[PDB]
Design a protein around this ligand. Structure first.
Ligand SMILES: *[C@@H]1O[C@H](CO)[C@@H](O)[C@H](O)[C@H]1NC(C)=O
Ligand SMILES: *[C@@H]1O[C@H](CO)[C@@H](O)[C@H](O)[C@H]1NC(C)=O
Ligand SMILES: *[C@@H]1O[C@H](CO)[C@@H](O)[C@H](O)[C@H]1NC(C)=O
Ligand SMILES: *[C@@H]1O[C@H](CO)[C@@H](O)[C@H](O)[C@H]1NC(C)=O
Lengths: 49, 297, 297, 49
């Protein structure tokens, strides 16, 4: 489940950071990267608990 | 140019069952030793597919509907079925797709066509030699505009009128999504005169022609066998031949697919067929052990 | 612990064609907004930078992509829609913006990716007598779906009174003309709009920017760029039996672990570079200052 | 008013007569007068005379 949780968009345009960074300028890329970071942090916390 | 064929005793077509047939590769990603679940347009398992007999005077080339996709299977030995026509009205007021297999040309034209009341291909026994060619190739009147006249190399196929026990199965899937007319095809040898064989085969992609036209109906082109016994008039003057073809329709279904080590799809599960199938789809396995499992709400 | 890449390699298909962007942008006739034309672009090399600084375009907005990075991406089947619209309605061509022209004419999806380009045509497309050749739909029963064209003209019926085609009370012609005249202000000056629409590649892609290809390097930790697929790893020959329609592979975790070279058409494994944790064994800083280091796995 | 209006000109600007029922205003003002038929064109939001 922790490995499968790496293919969720969490509201972003994509679940791949390389695709986001190769299509958007930094000021617009940070907005999607924040959503990805939030989702992945939540998944890690659930696994640890 | 048009003719009105007569002397055709229309009968209610028979119905048969498609057992585990019509599965295709849903994407170009290579997979191996994995169970993958996909949601797409598929032919449901154990579905009812109508049966047409092209062999008194039981001859049928009606204008079937085109509902979200069509599964087409034909079992023959003499290549009676050449191609299909696709379109909305077939009245030269709209672009109509065309696919034909003939040695002289394989018109894959996408042009407005004035299709006759009975679009057909006539293979006639000539007198100078045993040469076979279209008797009335003017299935249309004129192409006002051609958008995708992407004629490929003319397919070299033998032309003859003969009847015998069927030897090969050709299966096809037609889809029209996002301006793409996708075709998936297969060829497996079988020797039966009964209904569709019970087996699992996965159809591999053939072409992805981007015609981008509106399609609502479709009809099959069939080789009419004009002989010396028949008067030759384009109302009743032709011979029977032996052929059989089936039609099924695709619906939105979720399937669980199995890939072997070589990467071929060897089995599938239709989730909505049975509660047992839902249990298999939930557990992501083809085998279920003793117990009680919650599957839905 | 991380192993760092030594170099970078980029591999693009060898296509010498140049995309016909010139003819689409400045042609003799541009259609009206209610009936827009669509041009499909494929199998060529596109240089968007020259379009970015060709002429003083009134607006160049890109959604879902950045104009500077458009030169390094590969797409499939680029579309191009051109029409003539009033100056004040340009703001409604952006995705998600409600308005008259968005509701009853050209409408973009919420998840639109692409660039919208407009420029001023008052110098040429502004007749002193008045340009009435451009129409628009003012009445419609319901809202248009995204990327839908309406070409059917019928008398709009308002209220309980039925029109019956008389075109009388409570009945109006759906189309309304334009009053583009040089005497009008800047807001009423016509603007030509071209919308480029991109779809991300899953099938093989041939619309790629002018990027030179480098030699392939194997068995080294290297950065690669395969038709836009970016990453880092070690490229090794593989025995996986890709089918002719398959271009890349995936594992259970759905990560690209194989790829096919666009030029030489060979199958390459992708293995991430070595990494692990580092542990330091110490006997206590009071006893001594010597340490030992363990590299995990 | 709109249905079976039998009025020479029932024109609404900035709003549709069919949709007037749904949205709610307050303090509606009703101004009435008598003009000539040829002066109807002058009674418009953006005309002169
Ligand atoms: C396609 O043809 C049908 C007629 O069968 C028509 O109702 C429909 O509006 C046409 N267009 C689309 C997009 O389906
Ligand atoms: C995979 O292909 C090899 C090569 O022909 C064959 O020997 C093997 O039996 C195949 N595996 C199957 C069919 O499961
Ligand atoms: C059209 O645009 C291209 C690119 O800017 C330019 O080279 C060409 O001269 C233009 N043609 C006309 C007729 O303006
Ligand atoms: C160009 O690409 C083709 C693949 O379509 C390849 O066979 C050919 O060798 C390439 N030519 C060069 C000069 O790299």
């Amino acid at each position: 489940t922790l490995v499968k949780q790496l293919s969720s968009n969490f509201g972003a345009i994509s679940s791949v950071l390389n695709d986001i960074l190769s299509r958007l300028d930094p000021p617009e890329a940070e907005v999607q990267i924040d959503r990805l970071i939030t989702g992945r942090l939540q998944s890690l916390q659930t696994y640890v608990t | 140019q048009c003719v009105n064929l007569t002397t055709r005793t229309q009968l209610p077509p028979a119905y048969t069952n498609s057992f585990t047939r019509g599965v295709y590769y849903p994407d170009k990603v290579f997979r191996s030793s994995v169970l993958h679940s996909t949601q797409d347009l598929f032919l449901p398992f154990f579905s009812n597919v109508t049966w047409f007999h092209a062999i008194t005077k039981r001859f049928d080339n009606p204008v079937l509907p085109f509902n979200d996709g069509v599964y087409f299977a034909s079992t023959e030995k003499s290549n009676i079925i050449r191609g299909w026509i696709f379109g909305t009205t077939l009245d030269s007021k709209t672009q109509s797709l065309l696919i034909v297999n003939n040695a002289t040309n394989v018109v894959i034209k996408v042009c407005e066509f004035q299709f006759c009341n009975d679009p057909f291909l006539g293979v006639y026994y000539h007198k100078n030699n045993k040469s076979w060619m279209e008797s009335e190739f003017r299935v249309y009147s004129s192409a006002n505009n051609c958008t995708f006249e992407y004629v490929s190399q003319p397919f070299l196929m033998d032309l003859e009128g003969k009847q015998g026990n069927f030897k090969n199965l050709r299966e096809f899937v037609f889809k029209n999504i996002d301006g793409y007319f996708k075709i998936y095809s297969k060829h497996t040898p079988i020797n039966l005169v009964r209904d569709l064989p019970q087996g699992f085969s996965a159809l591999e992609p053939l072409v992805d022609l981007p015609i981008g036209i509106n399609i609502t109906r479709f009809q099959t082109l069939l080789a009419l066998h004009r002989s010396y016994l028949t008067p030759g008039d384009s109302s009743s003057g032709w011979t029977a031949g032996a052929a059989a073809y089936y039609v099924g329709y695709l619906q939105p279904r979720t399937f669980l697919l199995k890939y072997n080590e070589n990467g071929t799809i060897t089995d599938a599960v239709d989730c909505a067929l049975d509660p047992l199938s839902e249990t298999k789809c939930t557990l992501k396995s083809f085998t279920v052990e003793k117990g009680i499992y919650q599957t839905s709400n | 612990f991380r192993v760092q890449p030594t170099e970078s390699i980029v591999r693009f298909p060898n296509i010498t064609n140049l995309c016909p962007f010139g003819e689409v942008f400045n042609a003799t006739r541009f259609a009206s907004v209610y009936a827009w034309n669509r041009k499909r672009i494929s199998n060529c090399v596109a240089d968007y930078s020259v379009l970015y600084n060709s002429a003083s375009f009134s607006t160049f907005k890109c959604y879902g992509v950045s104009p500077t990075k458009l030169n390094d991406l590969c797409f499939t089947n680029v579309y191009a829609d051109s029409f003539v619209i009033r100056g004040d309605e340009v703001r409604q061509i952006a995705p998600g913006q409600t308005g008259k022209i968005a509701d009853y004419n050209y409408k973009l999806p919420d998840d639109f990716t692409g660039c919208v380009i407009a420029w001023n045509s008052n110098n040429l497309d502004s007749k002193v007598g008045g340009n009435y050749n451009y129409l628009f739909r003012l009445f419609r029963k319901s809202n248009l779906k995204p990327f839908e064209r309406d070409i059917s003209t019928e008398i709009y019926q308002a209220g309980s009174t039925p029109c019956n085609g008389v075109e009388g009370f409570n009945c109006y012609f759906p189309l309304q003309s334009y009053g583009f005249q040089p005497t009008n202000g800047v807001g009423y000056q016509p603007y030509r709009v071209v919308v480029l629409s991109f779809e991300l590649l899953h099938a093989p892609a041939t619309v790629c920017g002018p990027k030179k290809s480098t030699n392939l390097v194997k068995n080294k930790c290297v950065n690669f760029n395969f038709n836009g697929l970016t990453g880092t790893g070690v490229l090794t020959e593989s025995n996986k039996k890709f089918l002719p329609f398959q271009q890349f592979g995936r594992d259970i975790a759905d990560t690209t672990d194989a790829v096919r070279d666009p030029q030489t058409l060979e199958i390459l494994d992708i293995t991430p570079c070595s990494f692990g944790g580092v542990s330091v064994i110490t006997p206590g800083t009071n006893t001594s200052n010597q340490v030992a280091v363990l590299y995990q796995g």
